[PDB]
C-alpha cells in the first residue's frame, strides 16, 4: 500500500474503466449493462447490473 | 574616439567660466558643450557641486538637473 | 487668421465608404442663429466645439 | 481590550490586511513605516488617504498593514484601500456616523477606488494563441 490521494483516486477510476470493459465483453449474451464497485471492511464488492442473472 | 575623454587644463577653466547662463545642466548638456563624455562629465557634475554654481534640484541615474548660483 | 468656433447641435450619421466620418449640424458660437453642416474626423458627441478653419463652405455625401 | 477594527484591500490578487486599533498613532506596513513603501514614485498613492482627510485623524489610532500576493503595484493599491476602508471602519463602530459619512465623502469624491475594490481580473488564455484574445499567426499558403 501507501499511495498519494490523487494517484489513488485516479487509480480507482482506471480500476473502474477496466472492469466495465472486461464485463462488457464477457457477459454480452447475458445483457450486461454496467457495474458498480462498493468498498467496505472485510470485502470488495462488485455488482453486475445485467438483464439475465440466471446466466450469470 | 571623437575627443572629450580627458581634461586639458584649458577645458577645466572653460568649464569653470562657461557654467553660468546654464539654466539646464546635466550629463547631456555638458557633452553638448562639445566636450566631456558621460564618464568625466559626471565627474564635472560631482565637482561643480563640491562648491558653487550648480543647484541640485534633481535626483538620480540617467536623469540629473542643476541651475545657476543664487 | 480667422478662427470660427462652432458647437455641434445634432449628430447626423456616418459617411465615407469606410465609415469614420460623421455628418453634423453646427451653430457657431460667435453670432448664432445660423447653421452649417460639416464633416468630422474623430469621434464626436453633442455639444462639442469644432474649429471651422474656413467659415462658408459645406459638404454632404462622401464615397 | 482596546477599540480596534480590521479591514482589507485587494487589487488584482494582492490582498492587504489592515488592523486599526486605538493608540498613539503609528502607520506601519508589514513591519516598516509608511514613509518607506517604495515603489516610491507611487509613494504619494498610499499617503493619499492620510492627506484627503487630514493627517490629524490618526492620533488616536495605531495602524498596521501586511500585504501578501499580487505584484509590486498590485500591492500599493491594495494597502491604501485597506487603510481607507479601515479609517471608515473605525468611525462606523467607534466615533459617530455623521463623521464616518464625512470621510466616505472626501474619499469617494476624489477617489481611486479607496473604499471600493477593483473588479478587474485576469482573463483565461485560450488555445490557438499566447493570450486571451491574441490568436497565433496563420500564413494561408
Amino acid at each position: 500500500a501507501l499511495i498519494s490521494k490523487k494517484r489513488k483516486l485516479v487509480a480507482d477510476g482506471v480500476f473502474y474503466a477496466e472492469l466495465n470493459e472486461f464485463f462488457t465483453r464477457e457477459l454480452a449474451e447475458e445483457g450486461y449493462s454496467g457495474v458498480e464497485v462498493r468498498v467496505t471492511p472485510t470485502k470488495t464488492e462488485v455488482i453486475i447490473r445485467a438483464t439475465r442473472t440466471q446466466d450469470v | 574616439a571623437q575627443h572629450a575623454v580627458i581634461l586639458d587644463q584649458e577645458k577645466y577653466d572653460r568649464i569653470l567660466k562657461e557654467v553660468p547662463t546654464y539654466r539646464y545642466v546635466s550629463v547631456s548638456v555638458l557633452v553638448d558643450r562639445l566636450k566631456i563624455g558621460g564618464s568625466l562629465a559626471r565627474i564635472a557634475l560631482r565637482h561643480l557641486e563640491k562648491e558653487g554654481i550648480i543647484k541640485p534640484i534633481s535626483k538620480h541615474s540617467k536623469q540629473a538637473i542643476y541651475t545657476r548660483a543664487t | 487668421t480667422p478662427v470660427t468656433l462652432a458647437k455641434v447641435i445634432k449628430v447626423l450619421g456616418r459617411t465615407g465608404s469606410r465609415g469614420g466620418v460623421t455628418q453634423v449640424r453646427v451653430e457657431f458660437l460667435e453670432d448664432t442663429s445660423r447653421t452649417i453642416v460639416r464633416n468630422v474626423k474623430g469621434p464626436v458627441r453633442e455639444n462639442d466645439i469644432l474649429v471651422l478653419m474656413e467659415s462658408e463652405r459645406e459638404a454632404r455625401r462622401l464615397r | 481590550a482596546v477599540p480596534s477594527v480590521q479591514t482589507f484591500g485587494k487589487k488584482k490578487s494582492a490582498t492587504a490586511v489592515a488592523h486599526v486599533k486605538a493608540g498613539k498613532g503609528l502607520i506601519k506596513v508589514n513591519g516598516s513605516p509608511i514613509t518607506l513603501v517604495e515603489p516610491e514614485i507611487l509613494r504619494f498613492k498610499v499617503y493619499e488617504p492620510l492627506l484627503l482627510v487630514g493627517l490629524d485623524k490618526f492620533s488616536n489610532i495605531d495602524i498596521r498593514v501586511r500585504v501578501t500576493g499580487g505584484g509590486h503595484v498590485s500591492q500599493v493599491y491594495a494597502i491604501r484601500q485597506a487603510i481607507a476602508k479601515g479609517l471608515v471602519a473605525y468611525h462606523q463602530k467607534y466615533v459617530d456616523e455623521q463623521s464616518k459619512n464625512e470621510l466616505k465623502k472626501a474619499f469617494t469624491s476624489y477617489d481611486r477606488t479607496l473604499l471600493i475594490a477593483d473588479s478587474r481580473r485576469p482573463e483565461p488564455k485560450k488555445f490557438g494563441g499566447k493570450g486571451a484574445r491574441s490568436r497565433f499567426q496563420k500564413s494561408y499558403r
Binding site: 490521494k5 483516486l9 477510476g13 458498480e36 464497485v37 462498493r38 468498498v39 471492511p41 | - | - | 488555445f127 490557438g128
Partner: protein, 55 residues
C-alpha cells in the same frame, strides 16, 4: 489533450478535470463507538479513513 486522434485540423485542445474534495473530522470517544460508527455509515465512492494517536 488535442481532440483529434491524428494531426489534421485546427489544433483543438480539450481539457479534462476530476474533482478531489478532502475533509477531515476529529473525535474523542471509546473503542465501542468508533467501531460502531465506522463499520456502518458505509458509502460507496467516498473514502473513509480513521487513524488514531497524537503523532
Amino acid at each position: 489533450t488535442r481532440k483529434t486522434p491524428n494531426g489534421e485540423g485546427s489544433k483543438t485542445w480539450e481539457t479534462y478535470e476530476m474533482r478531489i474534495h478532502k475533509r477531515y473530522i476529529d473525535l474523542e470517544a471509546p473503542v465501542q463507538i468508533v467501531k460502531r460508527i465506522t463499520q456502518i455509515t458505509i458509502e460507496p465512492g467516498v473514502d473513509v479513513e480513521v487513524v488514531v494517536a497524537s503523532n
